[PDB]
Protein backbone atom coordinates (compact mmCIF):
# COMPACT_ATOMS: atom_id res chain seq x y z
CA UNK A 1 0.00 0.00 0.00
CA UNK A 2 0.95 3.55 0.01
CA UNK A 3 0.39 7.76 -0.23
CA UNK A 4 -2.52 6.60 -3.15
CA UNK A 5 -4.29 4.31 -0.79
CA UNK A 6 -6.92 6.32 0.76
CA UNK A 7 -9.07 3.10 2.10
CA UNK A 8 -12.52 3.28 3.21
CA UNK A 9 -14.02 6.73 1.72
CA UNK A 10 -16.83 6.63 0.12
CA UNK A 11 -17.15 6.89 -3.62
CA UNK A 12 -19.45 10.29 -3.43
CA UNK A 13 -16.28 11.61 -1.33
CA UNK A 14 -13.62 10.25 -3.75
CA UNK A 15 -15.44 11.76 -6.76
CA UNK A 16 -15.03 15.14 -4.38
CA UNK A 17 -11.46 14.85 -4.17
CA UNK A 18 -10.97 13.66 -7.66
CA UNK A 19 -13.15 15.78 -9.59
CA UNK A 20 -11.16 18.93 -8.42
CA UNK A 21 -10.49 21.28 -11.45
CA UNK A 22 -6.46 21.53 -10.53
CA UNK A 23 -5.89 17.74 -10.87
CA UNK A 24 -4.19 15.79 -14.38
CA UNK A 25 -6.65 13.23 -16.19
CA UNK A 26 -5.66 10.29 -14.67
CA UNK A 27 -5.38 11.33 -11.19
CA UNK A 28 -6.44 8.67 -9.20
CA UNK A 29 -6.51 6.66 -5.92
CA UNK A 30 -7.65 2.95 -4.67
CA UNK A 31 -10.33 2.50 -1.75
CA UNK A 32 -12.23 -0.04 -0.73
CA UNK A 33 -15.74 -0.98 -2.01
CA UNK A 34 -18.85 -0.02 -0.98
CA UNK A 35 -20.95 -2.62 -2.25
CA UNK A 36 -18.98 -5.61 -3.38
CA UNK A 37 -17.18 -5.48 -0.20
CA UNK A 38 -14.25 -7.58 -0.64
CA UNK A 39 -13.09 -5.72 -3.43
CA UNK A 40 -11.21 -2.65 -3.79
CA UNK A 41 -11.62 0.23 -6.68
CA UNK A 42 -9.31 2.57 -8.39
CA UNK A 43 -11.21 5.41 -9.01
CA UNK A 44 -9.38 8.06 -11.40
CA UNK A 45 -10.15 11.22 -12.68
CA UNK A 46 -11.07 11.36 -16.64
CA UNK A 47 -11.78 14.68 -19.59
CA UNK A 48 -13.61 14.68 -22.41
CA UNK A 49 -14.67 17.81 -24.05
CA UNK A 50 -18.53 16.91 -24.05
CA UNK A 51 -18.87 15.76 -20.33
CA UNK A 52 -16.07 17.35 -19.04
CA UNK A 53 -14.21 16.19 -15.97
CA UNK A 54 -15.73 13.26 -15.10
CA UNK A 55 -14.63 9.87 -12.71
CA UNK A 56 -14.56 6.13 -13.44
CA UNK A 57 -14.27 3.65 -11.05
CA UNK A 58 -12.38 -0.38 -12.14
CA UNK A 59 -13.39 -2.26 -9.15
CA UNK A 60 -9.68 -4.30 -8.12
CA UNK A 61 -10.77 -8.04 -6.93
CA UNK A 62 -8.25 -10.10 -4.63
CA UNK A 63 -7.75 -13.31 -4.92
CA UNK A 64 -8.07 -15.91 -2.57
CA UNK A 65 -4.75 -17.11 -3.75
CA UNK A 66 -3.54 -13.59 -2.93
CA UNK A 67 -3.14 -11.56 -6.15
CA UNK A 68 -5.25 -8.25 -7.90
CA UNK A 69 -7.03 -7.55 -10.75
CA UNK A 70 -8.89 -5.29 -12.77
CA UNK A 71 -8.79 -7.70 -15.67
CA UNK A 72 -8.89 -11.76 -14.62
CA UNK A 73 -5.96 -11.40 -17.63
CA UNK A 74 -3.73 -9.43 -15.99
CA UNK A 75 -2.97 -10.12 -12.44
CA UNK A 76 -0.30 -8.66 -9.73
CA UNK A 77 0.81 -9.82 -6.70
CA UNK A 78 -0.37 -6.33 -4.86
CA UNK A 79 -1.86 -3.39 -5.52
CA UNK A 80 1.73 -1.65 -5.25
CA UNK A 81 2.61 -3.60 -8.57
CA UNK A 82 -0.88 -3.05 -9.95
CA UNK A 83 -0.54 0.92 -9.78
CA UNK A 84 2.66 0.59 -11.24
CA UNK A 85 1.71 -0.96 -14.57
CA UNK A 86 -1.30 0.97 -14.97
CA UNK A 87 1.43 4.23 -14.60
CA UNK A 88 3.14 2.79 -17.18
CA UNK A 89 0.46 2.17 -19.33
CA UNK A 90 -3.47 2.46 -19.84
CA UNK A 91 -3.89 -1.11 -21.05
CA UNK A 92 -7.38 -0.88 -20.98
CA UNK A 93 -8.26 2.08 -18.89
CA UNK A 94 -9.16 5.35 -19.96
CA UNK A 95 -6.06 7.05 -19.22
CA UNK A 96 -2.56 5.62 -18.13
CA UNK A 97 -2.23 6.85 -13.65
CA UNK A 98 -0.63 9.80 -13.18
CA UNK A 99 -0.68 11.92 -9.90
CA UNK A 100 -2.33 10.11 -6.35
CA UNK A 101 -4.93 12.24 -5.69
CA UNK A 102 -3.97 14.75 -3.04
CA UNK A 103 -5.61 15.51 0.67
Same mark, same amino acid.
Given at each position: ?? %????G?? @? =? ?13 ? $????? =??? %? @??? $????? *? +? *????? /?? $??? +?????? =???? !? $? ?6 ? @??? !?????? +? /??Y ?8 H???? +????
Open positions: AE %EWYFKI @T =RRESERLLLNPENPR $GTFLV =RES %E @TTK $GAYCL *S +V *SDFDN /AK $GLN +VKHYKI =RKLD !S $GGFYITSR @TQF !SSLQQL +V /AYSKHADGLCRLTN +VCPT
